[PDB]
Design a protein around this ligand. Structure first.
Ligand SMILES: Nc1ncnc2c1ncn2[C@@H]1O[C@H](COS(=O)(=O)NC(=O)[C@@H](N)CO)[C@@H](O)[C@H]1O
Ligand SMILES: Nc1ncnc2c1ncn2[C@@H]1O[C@H](COS(=O)(=O)NC(=O)[C@@H](N)CO)[C@@H](O)[C@H]1O
Lengths: 425, 425
């Protein structure tokens, strides 16, 4: 979330920035202002009723020493106190809707971000590798994988319904390999490996941004009130909830691998054939809890940490800075890495590296006592895909395919997988 | 489940076997017989009413050629048609009640199995390795882990509540190692590695026994009508559900690593301080789909395959065959491997390898056409922990501990992990 003061002090600005996301967001500012106003109004109106009653009860007490006024007044007091609670019971209720409304406002995009209405308005920032030229029509990742028997869409559906695929044999061995290759690379660079729970309490999702706006997007175990995580980002980032960190500890780099679970309730008809959009996918996250003054540079570093995976792998890609209209609830600025999919003759999202400044830190309450001022300051959070395993696999299957159908294992995964090429079973 | 013929052909036997599990089961056998009877009666009476009807309808049709009998008979038909519905609509209710009843009876224990009411009447069948003796009081794994900063019980709770613990750094890097070491061993052995969905359709859990009896035990995602898996046994075994396999293919050996999710509604107050009983734990399962004749030999081999892990690891262990009173709903015979815990001064379940003969195969309908009789016969399924990664981690953290608190990396995992000993971070 964002600062209530920031809205009070500069509602103009907040509205122009939310406006770069969606003109329909401007209303959220008005509602919090209206809500905030009635809130401080009730406290003033009460501050009076409190004083009047206290004045009168004081006056019907000194009047105990004989007088009968204790009724035309003992009613102005009873009429009075019967409304202070009427209001107390609305301030309570007005502060509730204030708190919630605030949790529904997206992060204000950083000025450096280009303005746009949607994905078409994203800006390409750099490329790497030259997409392979084919002397034979290249095949889709789902075909090359079924024919090799390492992608069992049929059985996946038999067990879980659509958007579920069982990976098998070399297919699986390769998947694990990726995960291992990936983690080792990032840990060597300084990230703390960590295995987090996959089911999590609600606060956690409220902490990262997922809750409350995208609840229909998460699997929920209504019985235990725990949600399955849609990304390792959630558990990792909330690691230091309600804490005050030592500025010396900063920055905190941590990585992890986790199965990801998304109801994908929006993806209708889109990507219905391979493994690029599934209810369950493997992904190696990257998270950074840093000192405000280093956030944006850490962002740039993070994006490079991710590119490295792709280069080391020999998979051509390009980097895209997302425009305001495409940004994403928690992000203040973010780059997407897109890998080449021959079968589709286009680059496609394989990573999303973003900086959230204090947004997530605010709703999660993670601050630090700095070597200067001595006072508490909210930290900055960042996260990005240290390559979503599933999509990389698919990339691998397509960019390293052969006319006969086999797939050449990338030079750096061989030591992890076993073979150098996996031919038809 | 078991066949109903077996029930009506030797109800005696059935009742005595279930009696070894619980004498309160004997009634189930009576309910299926009393229900099978009511059903066989309806089908016979129905086959009669159906003949009488077609006989008459044919009779009132050749009589349409001038005749008025089509009243006293066209009534004997309506009165008759009036009853066949009545019966079809109760046979249905009858048969529902009959098939769910059957889904509640446990597998018949194999004679070989020792009789007993409790886990204390389970008998030891062999050991391996001698429990290290200490010069100092050995410390429990949670104590050693928190000291090493590899087990964060506080944060696991902050994130997901009790019985949820985050593993970090060397802890995490070691756990991964474990999973790799184990899948490599088994894969080398001839098991097919597979990455299965963790979210599964109900029938699948009905497939391996988990449902209906243990619904309260599995996390359910009420909105999408899917369950979280409590073991890779589930998705792997159900892989060929509703299939007719080619005997040439048998046996089918497969392995996999997956997070296991258990509501552990029962585990109350027991194992409340480490990671031996958690709502989420890693486990490399081992599943076999074999030909009936080889079932029990495969079981023996399975336990050896599992044992192998613990030996290469240098972990003292003992094997025990579970008595009928402790068997486990779908098992027909089952051994548990229990590793040595210094801090507890006792051996503890770390593996559970069982044989289900045709029980599981019968409820998921997996069979095969054999090179002999040509007819279809249900397969035999087996499965067992190729080590519950979590409890193994705990075991090596205690058995390889040192005065100063560091823990010595077991010899075979150092090429996987990195260091040879992980000292206070
Ligand atoms: N349903 C899905 N199936 C497979 N891969 C997916 C799915 N949804 C997203 N991804 C992949 O996962 C990546 C990261 O997801 S993201 O929501 O964009 N970003 C995050 O989750 C951040 N925490 C950074 O990982 C996407 O860029 C894409 O490569
Ligand atoms: N709640 C739990 N937390 C951690 N480990 C557990 C838990 N429950 C069971 N285990 C471990 O997992 C092993 C296998 O589980 S089991 O229920 O006995 N049997 C199975 O899971 C079978 N499906 C074979 O794997 C147990 O022997 C024990 O080592």
């Amino acid at each position: 979330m964002i600062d209530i003061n920031l809205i009070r002090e500069k509602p103009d600005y907040v509205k122009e920035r939310l406006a770069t996301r969606d003109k329909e967001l401007v209303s959220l500012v008005d509602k919090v202002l209206e809500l905030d106003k009635r809130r401080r109004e009730i406290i003033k109106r009460l501050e009076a009723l409190r004083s009047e009653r206290n004045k009168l009860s004081k006056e019907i007490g000194k009047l105990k020493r004989e007088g009968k006024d204790t009724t035309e007044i003992q009613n102005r007091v009873k009429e009075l106190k019967e409304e202070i609670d009427r209001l107390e019971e609305e301030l309570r209720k007005v502060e509730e809707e204030l708190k919630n409304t605030l949790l529904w406002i997206p992060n204000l995009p950083h000025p450096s971000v280009p303005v746009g209405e949607d994905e078409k308005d994203n800006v390409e920032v750099r490329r790497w590798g030259e997409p392979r030229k084919f002397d034979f029509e290249p095949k889709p990742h789902w075909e090359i994988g079924e024919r090799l028997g390492i992608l069992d869409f049929k059985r996946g559906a038999k067990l879980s319904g659509s958007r579920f695929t069982v990976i098998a044999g070399w297919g699986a061995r390769l998947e694990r390999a990726l995960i291992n290759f990936m983690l080792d690379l990032h840990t060597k660079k300084g990230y703390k490996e960590i295995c987090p729970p996959h089911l999590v309490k609600p606060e956690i999702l409220i902490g990262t941004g997922q809750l409350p706006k995208f609840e229909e997007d998460l699997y929920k175990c209504e019985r235990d009130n725990l949600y399955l995580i849609p990304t390792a980002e959630v558990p990792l980032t909330n690691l230091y909830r309600e804490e005050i960190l030592k500025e010396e500890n900063l920055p905190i780099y941590l990585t992890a691998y986790t199965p990801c679970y998304r109801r994908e309730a929006g993806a209708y008809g889109k990507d219905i054939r391979g493994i690029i959009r599934q209810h369950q996918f493997d992904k190696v996250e990257l998270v950074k809890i840093v000192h405000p003054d280093t956030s944006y540079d850490e962002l740039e570093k993070l994006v490079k940490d991710a590119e490295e995976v792709l280069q080391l792998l020999g998979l051509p890609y390009r980097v895209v800075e997302l425009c305001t209209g495409d940004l994403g609830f928690s992000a203040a600025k973010t780059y997407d890495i897109e890998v080449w999919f021959p079968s589709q003759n286009k680059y496609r999202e394989i990573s999303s590296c973003s900086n959230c400044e204090d947004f997530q830190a605010r709703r999660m309450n993670t601050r630090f006592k700095d070597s200067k001022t001595g006072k508490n300051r909210f930290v900055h959070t960042l996260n990005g895909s240290g390559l979503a395993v599933g999509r990389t696999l698919a990339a691998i299957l397509e960019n390293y395919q052969q006319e006969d159908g086999s797939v050449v294992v990338p030079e750096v995964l061989r030591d992890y997988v076993g073979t150098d090429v996996i031919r038809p079973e």
